[PDB]
Inverse folding.
C-alpha cells in the first residue's frame, strides 16, 4: 500500500527573488483545486532549487493552504520578501496515473 521511495509526496522548493526573481509562471482557473505551475525557466532560481513546471502549489512562505485563490497565491509570493518558501506537488505522476 505504501510506496518505498514515493509516488506523489509533496516537494519543497526554496527560491530567492533577488535581481532574477523566480523565473517561473503560474496558471489557475477553478477555485477548488488550487494554483499550479504553467512554465519554468531553465537554470532559474526555481530550477536551481529543484522546481519543475506542472507542479501543484501547496504553500507560500510557510502558509500551507490547499485551494488558495489566484490573488491569494500571487500575494503570498509578494509577501515572501526575497526568500519564497514554496511547497509544490508532482504532476509528473499525476499524468502518469492518467
Amino acid at each position: 500500500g505504501i510506496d518505498p521511495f514515493t509516488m506523489l509526496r509533496p516537494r519543497l522548493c526554496t527560491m530567492k527573488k533577488g535581481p532574477s526573481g523566480y523565473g517561473f509562471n503560474l496558471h489557475s482557473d477553478k477555485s477548488k483545486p488550487g494554483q499550479f505551475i504553467r512554465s519554468v525557466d531553465p537554470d532559474s532560481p526555481a530550477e536551481a532549487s529543484g522546481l519543475r513546471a506542472q507542479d501543484r502549489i501547496v504553500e507560500v512562505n510557510g502558509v500551507c493552504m490547499e485551494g488558495k485563490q489566484h490573488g491569494d497565491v500571487v500575494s503570498a509570493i509578494r509577501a515572501g520578501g526575497d526568500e519564497t518558501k514554496l511547497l509544490v506537488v508532482d504532476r509528473e505522476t499525476d499524468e502518469f496515473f492518467k
User: Anything to note?
Assistant: The chain has one domain: 1-98. The helical segments are 45-49, 70-78, 91-96.
